[PDB]
Write a protein that binds this ligand. Structure first.
Ligand SMILES: C=C(C)CCOP(=O)(O)OP(=O)(O)O
Ligand SMILES: C=C(C)CCOP(=O)(O)OP(=O)(O)O
Ligand SMILES: [Cl-]
Ligand SMILES: [Cl-]
Ligand SMILES: [Mg+2]
Ligand SMILES: [Mg+2]
Ligand SMILES: [Mg+2]
Ligand SMILES: [Mg+2]
Ligand SMILES: [Mg+2]
Ligand SMILES: [Mg+2]
Ligand SMILES: [Mg+2]
Ligand SMILES: [Mg+2]
Lengths: 280, 280
């Protein structure tokens, strides 16, 4: 094969990642916590975040071997956030991607604990499996991951989302504020941890952060568009802006994400193709 | 003052720690997650783990400035484990150290998320606030903390404890297995992260790990002794061994913890005094 095909590029990275994730949890005593963690971690899905991490690392002159442990850690973090999000105390989903939810399968106590275990393991895994990284770079990755997950990132976003339920004062700005924390921080971490591992400059990181923020929002706008075209109220992009402006804003976010990476040269084409996919 | 007094030694370290913890969480948007985290982190208590970390770091030729960020991270981890332990899905305690429990005060959703935030912040805080550490040492601390919290440590211990409820086959060995994960891993991490920061040898670390494991078990034996002298059934040390053997085993654990540190010379006296306290 001589030409770039996104579907096949992703297929190959998804396989490498799902093999690494499988490897990463050898069942030990107590077997149940490993069964519960494996249930959610190996449940499949797009594996976008690890793939973004590997992709951004390669973009910046790193390789898959350097990025794969961080890539896994990002998926462990993503999975923990899903396990916790599904809980009766939160969304109370009985199903996820056509499969029953962790707490329905093992109980709420085990689900809460499998989430905690995956978050812990993320940090252990990055350090124990990346001895070839520059130590100052790995520590910057650890700092970034801790910042991404907590009050200033993902957990901050979950609280901002809870605070939005049954309110009549949500604006496009406050909805964007929710999404930039809830999902944007982890997408940004996914491309910036890859770049940081490869030794990327502050200037290169700022472009990747713009890309990541814009693809994150674009995903959430398109999602809202698909919802409205297909529990207290919650305002969405189309409910606040109308469908015409929602659609133009999604296109414009994807355009700015693609332009943001143009100065990396053709090495950026895979990340640009991921952005285009969101609006195809 | 010319002589060592444990009560005053602890008072001084507890003050430095509670000031650092207070400092570590400046309220920002969304204020609620910072209020919820601060509620549990600043609720007081013995601050044993941070104090052990600072103490073991000083024992090994480090200082309080080197250890304080890790010391805080250990208390953040401890607090997260308490917030999660108290949840309706777990122990369902409405109170803790005479104060209402995080989920009663903010809700289960916020409590779950404040726990996640504190666990995340632990890792961020260690890296961002310890630039003077040797980078390979800090990464070993991060690895140790991730390993301590997860399936092989604290979360493993919580699952082993859940698995013990209403069983008739618990032995002193299986009760010890629960406690070495549930509390022993984090006490061990508390003295080993301090020692690792100060550049301690593998040989010195092994003595500190023996000390930490023995003071951890001694605490749990004495606790069971005090319970039985003062929900499905749960076997305890006195219910399995009798009170005479329980008491001899607590004394013997404390003796082995003190002997384990004798080869450090008099620098070990503070850690030895902490051990003696457990049985006084
Ligand atoms: C923080 C994250 C990404 C957890 C899932 O958030 P959502 O609430 O958007 O997910 P669904 O329940 O809609 O699947
Ligand atoms: C893992 C830890 C240390 C959480 C508290 O455990 P416990 O179940 O022993 O604590 P209490 O509810 O008895 O306070
Ligand atoms: Cl460039
Ligand atoms: Cl020595
Ligand atoms: Mg949800
Ligand atoms: Mg959900
Ligand atoms: Mg939406
Ligand atoms: Mg181009
Ligand atoms: Mg308990
Ligand atoms: Mg409890
Ligand atoms: Mg007990
Ligand atoms: Mg002595």
């Amino acid at each position: 094969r001589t030409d770039f095909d996104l579907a096949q590029y992703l297929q190959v990275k998804k396989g490498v990642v799902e093999a690494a994730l499988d490897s990463s949890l050898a069942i030990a005593r107590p077997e149940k916590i490993y069964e519960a963690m494996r249930y959610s971690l190996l449940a499949g899905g797009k594996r976008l975040r690890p793939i973004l991490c590997i992709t951004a690392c390669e973009l910046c002159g790193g390789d898959e071997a350097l990025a794969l442990p961080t890539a896994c850690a990002l998926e462990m973090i993503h999975t923990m956030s899903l396990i916790h999000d599904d809980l009766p105390s939160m969304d109370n989903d009985d199903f996820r991607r056509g499969k029953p939810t962790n707490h329905k399968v093992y109980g709420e106590d085990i689900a809460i604990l499998a989430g905690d275990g995956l978050l812990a393991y993320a940090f252990e895994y990055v350090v124990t499996h990346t001895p070839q990284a520059d130590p100052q770079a790995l520590l910057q990755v650890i700092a970034r991951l801790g910042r991404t997950v907590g009050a200033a990132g993902l957990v901050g976003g979950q609280v901002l989302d809870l605070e939005s339920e049954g309110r009549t004062d949500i604006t496009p700005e406050t909805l964007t504020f929710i999404h930039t924390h809830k999902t944007g921080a982890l997408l940004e971490a996914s491309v910036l941890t890859g770049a940081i591992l490869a030794g990327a400059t502050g200037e290169q990181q700022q472009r990747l952060a713009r890309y990541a923020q814009n693809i994150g929002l674009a995903f959430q706008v398109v999602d809202d568009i698909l919802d409205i075209t297909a529990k207290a109220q919650k305002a969405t992009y189309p409910s606040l802006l109308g469908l015409e402006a929602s659609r133009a804003q999604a296109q414009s976010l994807i355009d700015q994400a693609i332009v943001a990476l143009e100065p990396f040269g053709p090495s950026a084409e895979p990340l640009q193709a991921i952005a285009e996919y969101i609006v195809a």
